[PDB]
Design an enzyme around this catalytic site. Structure first.
Site, PDB file in Angstrom:
ATOM      1  N   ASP A 127       9.636  -8.001   9.030  1.00  0.00           N
ATOM      2  CA  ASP A 127       8.733  -7.137   8.301  1.00  0.00           C
ATOM      3  C   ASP A 127       7.347  -7.620   8.691  1.00  0.00           C
ATOM      4  O   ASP A 127       6.845  -8.596   8.129  1.00  0.00           O
ATOM      5  CB  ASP A 127       8.906  -7.287   6.793  1.00  0.00           C
ATOM      6  CG  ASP A 127       7.934  -6.421   6.019  1.00  0.00           C
ATOM      7  OD1 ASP A 127       6.998  -5.874   6.643  1.00  0.00           O
ATOM      8  OD2 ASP A 127       8.091  -6.284   4.792  1.00  0.00           O
ATOM      9  N   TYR A 163       8.021  -9.816   0.138  1.00  0.00           N
ATOM     10  CA  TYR A 163       7.847  -8.474  -0.424  1.00  0.00           C
ATOM     11  C   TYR A 163       8.008  -7.449   0.690  1.00  0.00           C
ATOM     12  O   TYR A 163       7.406  -7.579   1.751  1.00  0.00           O
ATOM     13  CB  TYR A 163       6.459  -8.339  -1.063  1.00  0.00           C
ATOM     14  CG  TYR A 163       6.168  -6.974  -1.656  1.00  0.00           C
ATOM     15  CD1 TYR A 163       6.879  -6.502  -2.759  1.00  0.00           C
ATOM     16  CD2 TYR A 163       5.195  -6.143  -1.101  1.00  0.00           C
ATOM     17  CE1 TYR A 163       6.632  -5.237  -3.295  1.00  0.00           C
ATOM     18  CE2 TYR A 163       4.937  -4.871  -1.630  1.00  0.00           C
ATOM     19  CZ  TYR A 163       5.661  -4.430  -2.727  1.00  0.00           C
ATOM     20  OH  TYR A 163       5.417  -3.182  -3.256  1.00  0.00           O
ATOM     21  N   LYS A 210      -0.162  -1.094   7.174  1.00  0.00           N
ATOM     22  CA  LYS A 210      -1.539  -1.574   7.072  1.00  0.00           C
ATOM     23  C   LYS A 210      -2.384  -1.324   8.320  1.00  0.00           C
ATOM     24  O   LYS A 210      -2.880  -0.225   8.523  1.00  0.00           O
ATOM     25  CB  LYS A 210      -1.532  -3.070   6.760  1.00  0.00           C
ATOM     26  CG  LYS A 210      -0.916  -3.430   5.423  1.00  0.00           C
ATOM     27  CD  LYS A 210      -0.677  -4.927   5.346  1.00  0.00           C
ATOM     28  CE  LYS A 210      -0.167  -5.309   3.986  1.00  0.00           C
ATOM     29  NZ  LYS A 210      -1.142  -4.831   2.978  1.00  0.00           N
TER      30      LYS A 210
HETATM   31  C1  LIG Z   1       5.237  -7.764   4.207  1.00  0.00           C
HETATM   32  C2  LIG Z   1       4.989  -6.435   3.472  1.00  0.00           C
HETATM   33  N1  LIG Z   1       5.986  -5.462   3.497  1.00  0.00           N
HETATM   34  C3  LIG Z   1       5.836  -4.248   2.862  1.00  0.00           C
HETATM   35  C4  LIG Z   1       4.679  -3.989   2.185  1.00  0.00           C
HETATM   36  C5  LIG Z   1       4.542  -2.633   1.484  1.00  0.00           C
HETATM   37  O1  LIG Z   1       3.712  -1.755   2.304  1.00  0.00           O
HETATM   38  P1  LIG Z   1       2.786  -0.622   1.689  1.00  0.00           P
HETATM   39  O2  LIG Z   1       2.044  -1.177   0.566  1.00  0.00           O
HETATM   40  O3  LIG Z   1       2.114   0.097   2.801  1.00  0.00           O
HETATM   41  O4  LIG Z   1       3.659   0.338   0.810  1.00  0.00           O
HETATM   42  C6  LIG Z   1       3.653  -4.945   2.136  1.00  0.00           C
HETATM   43  C7  LIG Z   1       2.379  -4.627   1.370  1.00  0.00           C
HETATM   44  N2  LIG Z   1       1.336  -5.494   1.264  1.00  0.00           N
HETATM   45  C8  LIG Z   1       0.151  -5.084   0.511  1.00  0.00           C
HETATM   46  C9  LIG Z   1      -0.409  -6.266  -0.326  1.00  0.00           C
HETATM   47  N3  LIG Z   1      -1.375  -7.097   0.448  1.00  0.00           N
HETATM   48  C10 LIG Z   1      -1.062  -5.802  -1.672  1.00  0.00           C
HETATM   49  C11 LIG Z   1      -1.575  -4.345  -1.783  1.00  0.00           C
HETATM   50  C12 LIG Z   1      -0.673  -3.411  -2.601  1.00  0.00           C
HETATM   51  O5  LIG Z   1       0.553  -3.661  -2.721  1.00  0.00           O
HETATM   52  O6  LIG Z   1      -1.191  -2.409  -3.117  1.00  0.00           O
HETATM   53  C13 LIG Z   1       3.805  -6.188   2.786  1.00  0.00           C
HETATM   54  O7  LIG Z   1       2.785  -7.155   2.746  1.00  0.00           O
END
Ligand SMILES: Cc1ncc(COP(=O)(O)O)c(CNC[C@@H](N)CCC(=O)O)c1O
Ligand SMILES: *Cc1c(COP(=O)(O)O)cnc(C)c1O
Ligand SMILES: NC[C@@H](N)CCC(=O)O
Lengths: 427, 398
Positions: free
Chosen positions: A239, A144, A267
């Protein structure tokens, strides 16, 4: 277990927001529905609007690695906000964080701050294509990278939990340029290059997956991706929005010794505030405006408040024993859940690296998204709810990695293992 | 007027970030290339790292409508962060801001919070297409929505008419800034918005207002409320964050239902709806709900705008523009400006000299001729007086 207030609020939210949440990952539809409404969080804990306390293994999905409401971060934020939260002009703090990020992440020689991981990835996508002059990207099934159109292809996270297809609303002509391959499958990636000569801008991926459950790259996988991308003058894009500053201070690239050309962050770099960033090789970043022609802007980007949160957070992570500790308590927890599943007679697998872990209800092992999907989702659902009743807050999905923080005590882990014993003994 | 510290800090930033900034315009490349580095902002002022103070008409590009570091916003934030800045789960404040936004914006019956106007737009374009099953979207040259797309001159209904005809059954909808601020201040000609609403309904297409900049500034309910034209979807940003990263997109309920986890269209966000950001937005709107808010903005801004134009007039400089509430524009061309092409006739070299002069006079204006200016509840009548006095001096020497 009373969730009266949560249900009251959630019922009202459904009429105000889609699914009554600001993010689909919070839905609870794959765990029996009925999300719990948080009132406050601190250290390793979260408190319900009903007063229930939980040992939190979500950490607001990664950001809270230093623990919830770390006093030094909150203190820094209090001082910072008195100076105005957003300027709309350059500020010293941007240089400080930029300098800190450049020194922390191997591949980053130049960085651009944005407001989320979604923005960072969308930006790196545009930069990949703008730099190489190629329009096709290779992303892996189960990974993702935010919700930018081209990434909504075989996406993990909420898409996987909700069992949705590639998101509608995206022109098929745009997703045509997004090639997909199974994670940990070099040959599949080799084949893709051979089939689209001179069209692959680069390969983007989570160097260690967390969005299709916890999945680690097989020996040589990352080294191979670097090798083949170099061969076709294609960029390697890590990523590390989730792995960044968590797997190690320098993320997966530092911990496994594989250096990409570009990497996205989010994050943790926001330390609890909305922040993201994309950086990498200087010659590539120079294409980003106003240095180069690729226009990418942001009103709140690099605001002093967010920068303060990030700087304080990274400063805490630089202290000695930090990652040693995270790996110390997470391995015990991980080994615990597995030893418990075994004893209780439940097929399970997974593992952990630093303060990031995964627990699948399937014998496995898991090497890719397909292997992950073989988990018993019904069992997980009962397991997630039972843990909730036992005071443990886990991500409402089998396809989300678990997180620990510098705030979790050995005591909290024991309590978590005890809960798992009680829950799995009743599964 | 020294800027030694600013030059040094900016010089060092160019080696750390592209152009040494987190956003293009901040580099001042359209007005000399010598950016000033902020250390703090308060009320209607901004302070350099060199100790220089300026009367700020950028307001961090829109968010600071209540004034920089408003004491009541900061207090709310302090109280709020003690409980944690991000939960990653539903919180009551989300319901509160959602209700306020729903009550505030005519077209919004259901809302989804994001972390920026760009995220809002990304999502709104994809929702438009998902709801209609069509790929084409119509936008206007000069309009900005972050970063299958048919363009057309702003304030040009016939050009829009043609686009629907040349692409039968392919247009998901039309999106635009109900009032322009991203190519200078450009208001819609009489009947333009009404026209767009009529043509969109005419072709079973959606009308989307990007009110990231106009929302809560032109009026509590944005342009759609003030001008009385209701779109199907609207994006919000800047002011709803009260100085923090916040954006949102909403509209008719049946349309928003397609948004996950309610529907198949995916859009998510880790920091979306965090309590800190919700607190900032809630406080900001409550303050805007107090008496005389928009009346005051319209008052000092009308004076400012009329003043600038009168000064250009008395000093022999062709100039055009105007204002609506606490949003205005000033072009170095007689225009008037009806679209991007008109705006492009402005004398950029003159604007640059002007901007630098004002800067030296203690006035911080947007570092671009193609940016709308903003006022705040913190701007006093004197600030405006001082501003016009500065504009006199500078234009006199232009
Ligand atoms: C590898 C990767 N790459 C991109 C993203 C998106 O980043 P963002 O949610 O700050 O928009 C993410 C987002 N992860 C957040 C999840 N743990 C669930 C929280 C949500 O999506 O609200 C990720 O893990
Ligand atoms: C400011 C603005 C945006 C961009 O929002 P960000 O928060 O910078 O991502 C989008 N549309 C309009 C009309 C804007 O003025
Ligand atoms: N869309 C870009 C402008 N809002 C400028 C943001 C900034 O640089 O602060």
């Amino acid at each position: 277990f009373k969730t009266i207030k949560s249900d009251e609020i959630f019922a009202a939210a459904q009429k105000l927001m889609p699914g009554g949440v600001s993010s689909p990952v919070r839905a609870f539809k794959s765990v029996g529905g009925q999300p719990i409404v948080f009132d406050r969080v601190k250290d390793a804990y979260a408190w319900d609007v009903d007063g229930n306390r939980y040992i939190d293994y979500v950490g607001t999905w990664g950001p809270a690695i230093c623990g919830h409401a770390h006093p030094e971060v909150i203190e820094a934020l209090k001082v910072a906000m008195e100076k105005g939260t957003s300027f709309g002009a350059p500020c010293a703090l941007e240089n400080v964080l930029a300098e800190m990020v450049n020194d922390a992440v191997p591949s980053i020689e130049m960085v651009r701050f944005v407001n989320s991981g979604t923005e960072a990835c969308m930006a790196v996508l545009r930069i990949m294509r703008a730099y190489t002059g190629r329009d096709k990207i290779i992303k892996f099934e189960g990974c993702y990278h935010g919700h930018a159109d081209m990434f909504l292809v075989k996406a993990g996270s909420g898409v996987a939990t909700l069992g949705l297809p590639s998101s509608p609303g995206v022109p098929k002509k745009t997703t045509a340029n997004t090639l997909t391959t199974p994670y940990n499958d070099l040959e599949a990636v080799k084949a893709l290059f051979a089939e689209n000569p001179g069209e692959i801008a680069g390969v983007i991926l989570e160097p260690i997956v967390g969005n299709s459950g916890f999945i680690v790259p097989d020996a040589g996988f990352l080294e191979g991706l670097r090798e083949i991308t170099l061969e076709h003058d294609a960029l390697l894009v890590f990523d590390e929005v989730m792995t960044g500053f968590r797997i190690a201070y320098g993320g997966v690239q530092e911990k496994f010794g594989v250096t990409p050309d570009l990497t996205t962050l989010g994050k943790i770099i926001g330390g609890g505030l909305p922040v993201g960033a994309y950086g990498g090789k200087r010659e590539i970043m120079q294409l980003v405006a106003p240095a180069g022609p690729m226009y990418q802007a942001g009103t709140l980007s690099g605001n002093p408040l967010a920068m303060t949160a990030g700087i304080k957070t990274l400063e805490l992570l630089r202290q000695p024993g930090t990652y040693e500790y995270l790996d110390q308590i997470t391995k015990r927890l991980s080994d615990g859940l597995l030893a418990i599943a075994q004893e209780t007679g439940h097929a399970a697998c997974g593992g952990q690296v630093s303060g990031m872990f995964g627990f699948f209800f399937t014998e496995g092992p898991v090497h890719n998204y397909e292997d992950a999907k073989k988990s018993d989702l019904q069992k997980f659902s009962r397991f997630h709810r039972g843990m909730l009743e036992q005071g443990i807050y886990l991500a409402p999905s089998q396809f989300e990695a678990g997180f620990t923080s510098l705030a979790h005590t050995e005591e909290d882990i024991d309590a978590t293992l005890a809960a798992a014993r009680t829950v799995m003994s009743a599964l």
